[PDB]
Write a protein that binds this ligand. Structure first.
Ligand SMILES: O=CN1CCC[C@H]1C(=O)O
Ligand SMILES: O=CN1CCC[C@H]1C(=O)O
Ligand SMILES: O=CN1CCC[C@H]1C(=O)O
Ligand SMILES: O=CN1CCC[C@H]1C(=O)O
Lengths: 273, 273, 275, 276
């Protein structure tokens, strides 16, 4: 099979790099297109083996699965540019935040009547094949289309099917989650440096701490609260540090963040509607 | 070689499980001892293949490397119990928080004059072989002793040598860090549930988000701030969520936490001095 | 070259551009004119001693200028356009500096007189006066391609300048348009802190200003983003990382984000209020 | 001073920044500069090599081939350096400590155990010397000749602002201009986040924020006004800027920067007293 990318943002690069690292796709069977392709990401993808072109039309003509990794504002402009080139073989996979299956199908249906559409919310760590992906199938997607999507995106991380009305919430949690983590890792590093550690060592240890904790959770049947309980010894350093987190309302800020991101995602649909 | 554990807390179990999963030690070459061994962790370690005993003395007699995974309060009581049994072959590895190499050597030197002592700060994710470990070598540790320690603890995570005066700070960062992460994952899950996701899915996606983000950081040369910049698209959901984190002082709470844990660790030394 | 520049309005922004353009030597002699209803005598004196021609009639500036800067308050823009509208000619480039006011609304006023007014909208800031301004501009629907290039070269002589899409200008206003006032507020507070710890006020003002200029210049001359530079200069256990913690505890970052957003939102309100 | 050699004990960020500024200003030949450091596997050590600076692992070699000696090491290393090279300090030497908090008195006391009249200067500079826009103060020790202080004023003025102060002000200077660039990097990172939130590309938001701050600082430096008057001058009635100033005030923005200068100054004083 052949995969194409319309758009060349951080996400298209991350997916193409994950797919090739996963060995599920010969990078020569990947094509990308952009309006502005920087001399870096161009040389990044050209050194990767990904054929490029500045015309979205050529990418559609040589690709089977079409990932749309463009800003939600640009999706309808793209769809009306390539809709005449959409064939029956194509599966159109929108990664745009908020943009609904219905709006994409209604644009494409003006050309050929049964577009096969999938909507997905994934994230940048597909680049190291630890992405978190959900997807919903559209009204003309054959059953095999969803199984293919599940197989392909599982090669670069966790992936599961959801009902479309959960995707804005998923965007607030795992779509934006890596930025929450980078912010937390920056701050944990500042705390390590304050108490005397070299910056390099502080960044490394904070990151390894988070990675091991998350893997511990993924590999147990327990919820986060029981694990917190398990590792907080009576009277110890850790329970003292947890108290100062609670005193600033640490937990509510992360709830606030998921909510704010989910709500903004819904606005990005409405503004594009 | 043969490894022994004095104490059977969450840490001794986590290390023994990591070592056996790593295949660096035949679990029959691991011995553990505890004052109170619960019928679970006993059956956990007995099903694992680890020989047990309720006498610390037998564990010393059949082990080469001796991990002391007991509360800092109990260390000097242990040392005066086993000090007469310490032989020239033994390497004594203290995992206790705050307890200094000097205090351990001064206890053991009352018996035989050149105890080989190592101090380390590791964490529970060694159980899934993603620990974060630092260690400092004592005044009679041969050079090979530190290289052995580095090899053994690298089989269950990241490991590096540090000067002893950084270890209290490391405790505040990666020693306590998993609890910070479990707290954050609990709260991120509450945020996902608030916006409509099933609890199971919310826990899974938050954890995968954190793991992928941390792996992304470990696999780039960049610091956390540049990665935050890379994934925050103009006007998007993520930058909106980051603002609400900043408005609650999210960053300062994690700095507060590392500081509080490091300071409490120093108190645990002084109270034991 | 042979080109002439005119200012309608004589507030602090128009003064700052006239002074910066003359310090740049980018125009021939006597090529700058400015007009206003009630110009204060100091501004009259300063501009006159600068070589800038002055007149109370906006029509005179229009008639002797090729590039026309409108540096008046957004509320005043519709009245000026009604006054000068019949005097706008094909050769003219109308550059609006008013916050919020859209190219669309300017072209709509001017088109009732002549059909194809050449309009550019820009957001610049006061430090053009020392040739370190930050300027963005957007071109209107009847601007020739050479009009944007002319504007770029002109405003580059007094600072950074780049073209943007018009829908970014409100956000630029919140960042570099209001930026200098955020900096003056910060420098006043840093000086207060220096004085609290025992420095003379004069020394505290100078040191804080020099620290901010040096820091901004470091960033401009590196490929790095600010986060990496913060990491580079915060030594373990040191005085600087201790002070960064107290900034974080008060949510220092969130306040500057709040400021950019508040200025951008108010700028959007200044368009609609005119519309 | 086309004949004098400059030496750096320490080859870190400050040493690189000064050496780069000194050579960029043409005030010193790079081959007249020598630096020593504990470990050579530093990015700063490699950059010094490429600049033409001579590097050595032995502090005593630096001492023996330099006339002006910059101590660019952490405060708690100063007493260890002074014990190592004290016997090699000759009469021609000017010793310039850049360490935060460490007093002239403590440096002279160590060196005087060897030769009796060490010429010592204490300074507090900052990283922007690397683009020749540093902010520097210095105080002269009890055996410094009058030409030593004016030589110091001459050398450091080539990489930014420089003035002599009484020593009891240097801890305060550290909290203001020593730590100052870090306050600005934090402020620039947040302003860029603000620009991005409102729809600007990140690269453009970084560029515009930096240019705004540079131009503001230069405006202030080039007037006789204090910052308050300039804030008044650029804040038009009912406008976007004054609305934004109000939200800064509502979070106590001014008090946070006062808190910062104070916290850095207090920590600098602790760094001395710990070493004492
Ligand atoms: O209880 C957990 N931990 C991990 C670091 C040391 C110990 C403590 O909290 O004191
Ligand atoms: O910019 C990053 N992301 C990830 C989720 C969607 C997009 C956004 O912020 O709008
Ligand atoms: O680390 C940076 N600096 C600049 C001033 C002194 C030193 C410190 O923070 O202690
Ligand atoms: O008053 C100052 N300024 C600078 C940006 C625009 C204008 C305003 O605040 O509305």
């Amino acid at each position: 099979m052949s995969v194409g990318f319309i758009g060349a943002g951080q996400l298209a690069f991350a997916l193409a790099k994950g797919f090739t690292a996963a060995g599920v796709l010969a990078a020569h069977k990947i094509m990308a297109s952009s309006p502005d392709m920087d001399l870096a990401t161009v040389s990044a993808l050209r050194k990767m083996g990904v054929k490029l072109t500045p015309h979205n039309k050529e990418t559609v003509q040589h690709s089977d699965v079409l990932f749309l990794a463009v800003k939600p504002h640009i999706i309808p402009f793209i769809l009306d540019e390539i809709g005449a080139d959409i064939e029956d073989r194509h599966i159109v996979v929108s990664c745009a935040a908020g943009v609904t299956i219905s709006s994409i199908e209604k644009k494409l249906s003006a050309f050929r009547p049964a577009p096969r559409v999938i909507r997905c919310m994934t994230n940048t760590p597909v680049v190291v094949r630890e992405g978190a992906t959900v997807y919903a199938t559209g009204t003309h997607a054959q059953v095999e289309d969803g199984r293919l999507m599940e197989q392909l995106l599982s090669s670069v991380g966790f992936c599961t099917e959801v009902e479309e009305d959960l995707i804005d919430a998923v965007t607030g949690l795992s779509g934006s989650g890596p930025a929450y983590a980078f912010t937390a890792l920056d701050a944990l590093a500042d705390g390590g440096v304050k108490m005397g550690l070299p910056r390099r060592l502080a960044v490394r240890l904070g990151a390894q701490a988070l990675l091991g904790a998350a893997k511990m959770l993924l590999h147990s049947e327990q919820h986060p609260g029981q694990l917190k309980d398990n590792v907080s010894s009576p009277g110890g350093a850790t329970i003292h540090a947890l108290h100062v987190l609670e005193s600033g309302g640490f937990r509510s800020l992360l709830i606030n963040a998921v909510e704010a991101s989910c709500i903004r995602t819904r606005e990005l649909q409405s503004m594009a509607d």
